Write a protein that binds this ligand. Structure first.
Ligand code: TTP
Ligand code: TTP
Ligand code: TTP
Ligand code: MG
Ligand code: MG
Ligand code: MG
Ligand code: MG
Lengths: 481, 492, 481, 492
């Protein structure tokens, strides 16, 4: 067995270690070829046809690059080729648990289809990685290349999902704590996963990337913080670090939370919900599963990809008529109409408990205008969007450690006061989008009146087009003055 | 509610779409209407490079986005010709018609694009003659009638029965002296924009060069925007034709060189081709058992779906996964081939060779070549005997788009001093470093037996075959078959 | 006379109208080939060898692109090919007044060499444009292409420098107000000049551009605001507008105000000051000028470019020995040492009046530590840097007008409350950098103690490396806790 | 103050530099020390493409940044060969030596790079033989001695008198059977990295392809990182040499095709060449009057500055502006030529042609060609008579880097199955679409009289000359000289 060279448009010519190849060339991994990275985003950005597969190769490659560089500069860290492999494997396998249309699946569909469960793609990756290992006889191949399967398998899973439960990790000790920061960084969100998707999503979307990951690597060291050896950034790179998160927020703002992309995700989810009772997926021992229950059997889940969208679209079964008809509305570009957007004021926070109650509120607003139609709760969609720097209210830079030129082994902290007064004052906010399922001109005009009135009643921000969409409603609120 | 010169101002707003290749593009509402149909959206589910994605992981792009690009570039080119030369009388109607043909040129592609009409249909239904271009005509007709497009066309100044006919001609060529009916000789240049049958210079290439490169990780060296700036329309015979600036002839040869490089590096990749072959095999073994419902509830096969546009609408890359995920025991053989692809247990590449001098392998004889390889008698002591059925012999025609011909012999040029005067430039006049010939054949051989002993044997059979046929010495000949190469001293 | 096609790496193949060619092909314009865009930046970023010339072609091209697009979409605006040309010419000629090393010249050198005068490159461009016109017989060529020289020349100058003095402009009336917003936008800083330099500087620097000017153009319209027809942006592009200014700030932060690039500018300026009495530049009627007085004669100024740096470096004249020796220190990379950086706290603002007094303050600090050397005022450089969004304390978006999808001819305003709580709270700040001209280890150690002590005394922010460079000084200040 | 295994940990910090082409690069302190000298910084003031900047406005890049890139790539290549093959015994000392040669290969370039040793010196001082490469040796020596580099070299494990000699050999080739002294035969591959005299495959090209393209606005199609991954060291004869993977032979031919394209589009641009010519003319007319102070206060001319490295250090593109800004009446003629450049009053291009068959124009005879053109007798009624001195005849040798030879005939390959075994691949074995020849000549003619009547006349003289000499028909022949082309029916 020898290495393969593979050409990636983002990273160029990459070397794949035979062990990685062996993992790659399985039904469980190849599955990621059939799941779009940005889900419904492709229906708004025609370049975004890329799949989780190629992203996963990139993460695996970057993970190895970062670990290798840290090792070359600091042999005292005792990074072995075994460690490198383990980090590469976790990089490759971090996304094994994604379902159809990626985040649509665990973000929208599963919570609606099966509210009793708690499911994340990351948990799925653990289960799928286990399934991949056992079904393909990977352990002996691991041993052949110097890995210790029981330790390292556990290590790999920890890197993907976090602690499986004081130093909470078992796969590696405190003096290799930095190995847990590479693929998925739970402490501050600085990891190679972002680095790949920034570059790859940008290449495909037609938006240019502004973050330089290679610079970051050159300015990265490992320093003692408490009893852990941790990744530290050069002090004067703090500005570039804030920009990294700004880039993340810009991508979510422009692309990942696109108002129409979100509506397409919603519509696809609706179709899936209406198909869920009637579609059968065969899993372990011939047992049958639904779209919503395929997550319980990794054999069935292996066969659950974006294909499901087309199985529904091409179906003839009269019981799939409702599902099929929603997908056809997507093809004819007869989508739910966007009504507007607003935000909470001050420190008001919309709780997820209450998301379900918001369409009723909008429908219950009493705009003092002449209308030709009355709209019901079910005619409205209210999509609440949490935009943040990856750690809710928190500033990630408060959880980053730095080093100075004069003392490169000494970890320090940098506070927000010490950086720049032009930075954000807060690190989380909510965006509220409202849509209407009734698409004619009269319903849309009405929806707008209900919406702006709702905004006024709730003391939400004045919609940007408020004076134009609801001129009779906006004077009423002099806070909007 | 604003007025200018006493007339009301009407604001028409176009849809803007962001393409990574072309940037922000404006789509005319008529184009949008055509785009937003099941017949056009279908192209979202057919990969541009087919099996190429299984070798180049960036190549996940679909025919859909390529089609938007062709449509956009077609409009860009026509518009530019018009701005520079009003005397050509290019109308906004002409522009639209060329854009539409650009959008719709690929409507007829099937699963994995060229795999389908290039490999599968010829094997599954040898009696028929099918091309994706014909499919595009049928599919365009089906798109038009099923979505009530004609009145929308009329609304924007088009004359449907003229223009529909025009659009089809642009896509497939003449439908039966000046052979075209959609437009006359003095708009001959409109037929050169989307699909150029005379010399292969068209916007379709311009899009795929750039788009394929962006996705593949190979950099594009052709500059289409430069070409447009150096393009004019000049009288050639009695036709008004697109002419290139004389000193751009070097760049023109390079355009075709880029095309050949892309075929060489990517489109004809030895492993990409084997994956296409394997997928085709799976399809052939599934063709009796898969049902696709078309017009009036009629059932069709993968191979017969091309006869009904309603069924064909539902025939995309999905078929690969339908086969892969199937449980039906009758699909077991098909399914098993696709599983071998997933486990990367592929047919092994044995080697490559070419014919010598000007010998040409006739397509008639392709089928007889595996028997020849198996019938070779290599003087090597072997552990296995291989049969005809163990070998695949893939003959590849590499050329400049016009068989033996030099496309530049069919290009017309203009000079700075007389920009309305068309001239010819011969190969003698340009550069002695250019190719002497414009077509060749590459012969690849593979073995379906994948173990080490069979592969070693296959190599001996292969190189022996090459020696017997007076083919070129394989590049790795002395290493893969050291006992076989000395016999042939032409190979010294 | 025919058009030329020119290939620019940024904009691709561009068409140049013969009138533009005629202006381009003069000593006054070709001069810009010998003045680096980023001045001393090239000595930090080796890709930044680009000159004002190519930037000027780009601005001229983009100016035409923007005006043409506005015209195609809105014929009611009555944009003529004459207007297009006038805007292209102003774009080409906006930078004619730059001196050696661009902003170094009017930003550093002239204020030190001739404090009594008030000089800006923009004024220089006006003078140089006039000189270009008269010396090359451009007026009849202008007339040949439908321009009216007395009107249009005046128009062009207004576009470059602003009002030459209620509607304050004479070259065009209120209903073409939008033509003044294209090359140099004094109202809100949204103009094609930025658009070119973002892209061009990025291409050369090795930093990726994140702003999409072509998108902006597609979402731009002209709408009535007061009595003026003004450029308006689509409402939902407000997020992208804030990002435009963020990109500007990032470029200044990373590149244009690089701590070492600024020191090289300083050193070059010092050399120029020490050479200014001895270098002769021949101007109009054979009269002699200095580097500092060449700005008074456009004929002499025409011959004043980056060449001056090499004339000094290659000189043998003993009177240039001091000047020459500073440039040699640059070549040997014996530069002034960076000591650290800090900022003012709260709403404190350092006035430019006081900049000169700051080195004395630093030298007068009394750090309670053992030192081997005493440093004087003249050993310190204190570089105060104003970082802002282009309009001092102001938010440029408060001076932008928008339009909505439903009413594309209706101008509206969008306030900061209506956008995003993750945006900056303030739009200006100051950065204070300190350097030491004594380069040995003992002086640098001392300089650091003086500096951090100075920061403590002034209630400035704790330097990022404060605890490492001056561990004995930082505990003292518990505000830094 | 941290310890591991009981020994103190020492943190060495490298300088990081950001290059737009290569990204963030690490510079070893020894390299920094060499970089930060007047001799090296000088390269900041010499444009890579000389007069090319006056045609391609992006091409403002200087030799400095190119030199950093070559040095970086040289290290990248050596490092990669070493990682894959430890048996080669590549040391960090070897790495440094190759990096240094990479950095310093261009130290000898003069004003406007190739204009200087290619045009000016041969005209200004015909008795001498001068190349920039020789200059680099002299300048490297001067850099070393003037800046006390040897002890710094020793400090980092180098052996100065061996390694200095090695570095010079890498730059200029052999300094007087195995002809090299700096390293033995089993490190022969180290001589192939910076400047490859055997087949032209080296990192110098790799940098300039990418860097020139980035600046010019022409896109690069060669992938150097791919090449590195497919490169090995194999025994060829008794030398260890760099070998390419067999199936990369297609990409290798394309590498040289890219080189030829760049020369064709950019480096030999018909107007760029005329600007080089005009600048050279100015320099020639200034050469008697400009003084450059060198070692011990001695005075030198532009043409004699090459004899003293101290003077030469001060000879850069600055000379162009010194001439342009001068007031001395003795520089009036020189100054006036440069002013014509600024006003874009350039010598007019007349046309281009080539020799036929395998006729070769000898360099001896270049000087006699303008007389020939002026002596042609075109049967056209003209308003002016042109003289020899009114014509410029620029003969351009276009080739694959080794005159008539195919570089691929001098490349060694390895196969997948036997990666330590060097083999040869012949042209027959690869592709019949490749060039038949590897060298040719282009003849450009210009006229120093710029008015409309002289230019019309020049064209008649030129095409007539072409007919008389049996040269190829100019591409615009029938348009520029319609009365002249019929006479020659070989041109039909
Ligand atoms: C041939 C070729 C492949 N590629 C891509 C496709 C793959 O992603 C990657 C490696 O492809 P190849 O080098 O073609 O890999 P292979 O496995 O076919 O070769 P072998 O087993 O004989 O060594 O490079 C290029 O980018 N350029 C090229 O010229
Ligand atoms: C919001 C946004 C979209 N896009 C892409 C997605 C699409 O391909 C294209 C158009 O996006 P939008 O301008 O968002 O189009 P829309 O139809 O959602 O807006 P509206 O109907 O309100 O006018 O641009 C960007 O490139 N950048 C951006 O910032
Ligand atoms: C600050 C900065 C510099 N650069 C470039 C400029 C240089 O070419 C290279 C190195 O810049 P710096 O890292 O700023 O180097 P420095 O020598 O100024 O810093 P120090 O001595 O404090 O370690 O990177 C960036 O590309 N991006 C950035 O954000
Ligand atoms: Mg392989
Ligand atoms: Mg829309
Ligand atoms: Mg010209
Ligand atoms: Mg530094």
């Amino acid at each position: 067995d020898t290495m393969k060279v593979i050409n990636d448009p983002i990273h160029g010519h990459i070397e794949l270690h035979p062990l990685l190849v062996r993992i790659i060339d399985t039904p469980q991994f190849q599955r990621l070829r059939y799941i779009k990275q940005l889900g419904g985003g492709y229906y708004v950005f025609p370049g975004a046809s890329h799949n989780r597969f190629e992203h996963s190769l990139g993460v695996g490659y970057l993970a190895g690059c970062l670990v290798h560089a840290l090792g070359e500069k600091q042999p005292e860290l005792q990074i072995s080729e075994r460690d490198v492999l383990c980090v590469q494997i976790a990089g490759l396998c971090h996304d094994l648990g994604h379902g159809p249309f990626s985040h649509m699946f665990d973000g929208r569909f599963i919570p609606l289809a099966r509210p009793e469960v708690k499911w994340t793609h990351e948990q799925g990756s653990v289960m799928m990685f286990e399934h991949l290992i056992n079904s393909n006889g990977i352990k002996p191949v691991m041993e052949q290349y110097g890995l210790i399967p029981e330790e390292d398998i556990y290590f790999i899973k920890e890197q993907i999902v976090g602690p499986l439960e004081l130093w909470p990790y078992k796969g590696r000790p405190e003096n290799k704590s930095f190995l847990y920061e590479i693929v998925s960084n739970k402490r501050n969100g600085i990891d190679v996963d972002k680095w790949d998707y920034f570059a790859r999503d940008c290449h495909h979307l037609g938006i240019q990337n502004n973050f330089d990951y290679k610079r970051f690597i050159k300015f990265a060291r490992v320093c003692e913080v408490d009893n852990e050896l941790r990744i530290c950034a050069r002090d004067k790179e703090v500005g570039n670090l804030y920009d990294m998160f700004h880039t993340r927020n810009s991508l979510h703002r422009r692309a990942y939370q696109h108002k129409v992309g979100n509506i397409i995700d919603t519509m696809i989810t609706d179709a899936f919900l209406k198909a869920d009772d009637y579609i059968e997926i065969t899993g372990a021992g011939g047992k049958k599963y639904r779209i919503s229950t395929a997550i319980d059997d990794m054999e069935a889940y292996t066969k659950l990809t974006d294909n499901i969208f087309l199985e529904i679209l091409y179906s003839t079964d009269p019981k799939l008529k409702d599902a099929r008809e929603i997908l056809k509305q997507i093809e004819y570009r007869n989508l739910f109409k966007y009504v507007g957007e607003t935000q909470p004021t001050g420190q008001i926070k919309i709780k997820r408990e209450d998301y379900e109650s918001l369409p009723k509120e909008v429908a219950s607003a009493k705009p003092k205008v002449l209308l030709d139609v009355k709209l019901k709760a079910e005619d409205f969609i209210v999509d609440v969007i949490n935009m943040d720097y990856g750690m809710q209210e928190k500033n990630p830079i408060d959880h980053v450690s730095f080093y100075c030129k004069t003392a490169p082994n000494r970890a320090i902290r940098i506070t927000k006061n010490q950086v720049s007064q032009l930075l954000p004052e807060k690190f989380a906010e909510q965006l509220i989008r409202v849509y209407c399922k009734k698409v004619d001109r009269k319903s849309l005009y009405a929806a707008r009146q209900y919406f702006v009135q709702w905004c006024a009643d709730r003391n939400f921000t004045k919609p940007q087009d408020g004076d134009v969409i609801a001129p009779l409603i906006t004077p009423q609120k002099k806070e909007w003055n």
